[PDB]
């Protein structure tokens, strides 16, 4: 099928922690991360980018699910301009998308990143998930204008979905979000490491990855991994099943990253919200 | 089968180099790394942690081989307290274990780490090994109380099994340990990267990894790798066979790590000690 | 078959950017990277190293394709000396070679590195490539004599084949080289991360890796990867096919690396040079 996707490059204030501290973000659609894009393998994506008239910078769009021309297709457009391009999603899995404007380190760091999920055309290629969650790791830099600090990898926090300990109510009493599932259910994590710079060594504390799929591709399946290494600009699908009620903590096991905000708690309970990890709730905002 | 495993959280002085320099370590059973734990896939482990009465800190236990509740099972216990929990080793391979107390970065860095080996139930899943060796990489931090330096990744050394160049008699004439095998023998390395922060790019100088198993699982086999990337908090099983007498040097190929202590020499000779890499000698102390 | 390979350890000035800035390099055969060595699986390599009489340092040779003795075979030789050793290339793929002299961090960083390609004995193990290109990543350090800066990972640039933005005429107007292919052709990238310290997260902007082979081995094939992580001292074979005319940009997706020089443009055109990526032109100098 043919799907139409329109995103707006918007420069606006967004929250980055649980106390409501704000940041001068650059975004797709006024939020960090950008909207989840979801298509089926083989679908035609008609993409439109609108750079908001109030933006002070040129912006662009790069989909890792696209096979196109970097020069013409991923070109930067000025505030007030609109760009269109079309691509087929040739490969199933999970893919990073981000602004490709100069310099990419800053456009990514300021929040212009998201995920495109490409469901396999074969519905039985992956085992059936009972829950799905999107987690996108990124480094947070204190001064969004300081490109030197970014080049030197001097981040202040490492976060999931734009927030320091956004999903950790165990550590942070001010955290208001967490992942939910029932014991025995297959929880599918769509993970993207946006970077811009750092690696992620993703581990579920008190659990194990049942299956891991590099780039989300069913052909690359690995089994029963305690940890999985996701480079900057890479993505994977990771399945998790708890045999008991309680919690796991999804962490970047590079402890300095974890202690800086990269911990997401999943609660396994018999009374899990039936709407959690389903429909529009896969990226918890 | 059901086995019983008791470990003691002990805060004590241990040596970290070949000239007998000491460190105020936090340990399992007064040694770094902790005792090797070894079970068969499917086994029930009845675990007991005793926090020594002389400890000044709360401690805990996290097994990557366990599927439990992070909140209740991996909880911290005070000096003088005893905690018990039970888990089944559901998956074969090699798994990181460590203290999960606040902050994990420091508890790991000070020496509270080890390995649990889970032998496959199918005795023919892995090719028969003639030697087995445990190698655990960690960063050594000069001041064990300086949590800031740990957060900033300012380590002094990168070590195998708690010692700077512990297994490198070629470079350090004061080194008294090395790995042993005969030419043609299959040497199985159980490798754990304890971190807390850094990645390991493991390479046998003058050799090649015959086979590598991510998380030690037979299902994930990769062949003839010159190097293998092990993230912080990850583990793998790596097989090595030398066709000749001589030496290989197992290194973290990120050279700054290798030069800071991450080199382990394996000697291939016809007169190799029949006790080496067998029974109780797999982690050479 | 038996092949004879002679390399000279030569200390000489080489260019490292597009304005002809020079560096006091340590090299094999007066160039960075060293000459491409290419053999067939099972071949016998009779290797000779000649340390140039005017060298001020001892040098050596370490092939990741060799299974030998680090002590005797990879030993350092003085200026004016000649060393010989023989090895069989037992495993097919792509392998790092470098000087193994003290300290390796500096010998690698100053330019003593290259690639050995070992073609599979089974000519149908890999799909047929229409183009082949060698790309070797390394960190460039401003002061070649400053070993502390190297140990602290304080590089100035991250480069492909010894040059800052060597293959990026889109960004740098002074760049005179780029990769070439026609749409629909299978482009095979032989990639080596020489380091000495850093990891590479390799991604083709506006493309996807059709196939990736860890250590270039056909047995380890992975499919449709947006990115692939190559540790320091590791190598991989990565296949790329563009369905359209235009360009892809091969980048280390850790953005601070890319912005510091790690970007190589491949141009897909109907009028691509029939000599490009073939015969003697696989490593573009
Ligand atoms: Cu932008
Ligand atoms: Cu990207
Ligand atoms: Cu502890
Ligand atoms: Cu852990
Ligand atoms: Cu040298
Ligand atoms: Cu090497």
Automatic annotation (TrEMBL), chains A, B, C:
Binding-site residues for Cu(2+) 2, renumbered to this chain: 62, 64, 98, 253
InterPro entries: Cu-oxidase-like_N, Cu-oxidase_fam, Cupredoxin, NO2-reductase_Cu
Domain (Plastocyanin-like): residue spans on this chain: 16-122
Key word Metal-binding present: yes
Entry EC number(s): 1.7.2.1
Keywords of the record: Copper, Metal-binding, Oxidoreductase, Repeat, Signal
Names of the cofactor(s): Cu(+); Cu(2+)
Protein transport found in the keyword field: no
Subunit structure: Homotrimer.
PANTHER family membership: FI03373P-RELATED, MULTI-COPPER OXIDASE
Protein name: Copper-containing nitrite reductase
Annotated organism of origin: Nitrosomonas europaea (strain ATCC 19718 / CIP 103999 / KCTC 2705 / NBRC 14298)
Organism placement in taxonomy: Bacteria, Pseudomonadati, Pseudomonadota, Betaproteobacteria, Nitrosomonadales
């Amino acid at each position: 099928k043919t799907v139409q996707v329109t995103l707006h490059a918007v420069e606006t204030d967004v929250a980055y922690d649980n106390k409501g501290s704000t940041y001068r973000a650059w975004t797709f659609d006024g939020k960090v991360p950008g909207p989840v894009v979801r298509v089926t393998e083989g679908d035609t994506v008609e993409f439109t980018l609108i750079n908001d008239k109030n933006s002070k910078n040129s912006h662009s769009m790069d989909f890792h699910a696209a096979r196109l021309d970097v020069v013409e297709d991923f070109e930067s457009i000025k505030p007030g301009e609109t760009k269109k391009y079309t691509f087929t999603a040739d490969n199933p899995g999970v893919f990073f998308y981000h602004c490709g404007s100069d310099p990419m380190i800053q456009h990514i760091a300021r929040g212009m990143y998201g995920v495109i999920i490409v469901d396999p055309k074969d519905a039985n290629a992956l085992p059936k998930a009972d829950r799905e969650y999107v987690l996108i790791q990124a480094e947070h830099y204190e001064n969004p204008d300081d490109k030197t600090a970014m080049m030197q990898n001097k981040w202040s926090n490492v976060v999931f979905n734009g927030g320091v300990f956004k999903y950790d109510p165990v550590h942070d009493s001010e955290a208001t979000s967490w992942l939910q599932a029932k014991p025995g259910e297959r929880v599918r994590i769509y993970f993207v490491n946006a970077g811009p710079n750092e690696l992620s060594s993703l581990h579920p504390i008190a659990g194990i990855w049942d299956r891991v799929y590099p780039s989300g591709n069913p052909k690359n399946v690995q089994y029963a991994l305690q940890s999985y290494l996701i480079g900057a600009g890479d993505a994977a699908t990771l399945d998790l099943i708890s045999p008991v009620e309680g919690a796991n903590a999804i962490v970047d096991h590079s402890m300095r990253h974890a202690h800086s905000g990269a911990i997401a708690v999943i609660m396994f309970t018999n009374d899990a919200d039936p709407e959690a990890g389903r429909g529009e709730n896969i990226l918890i905002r």
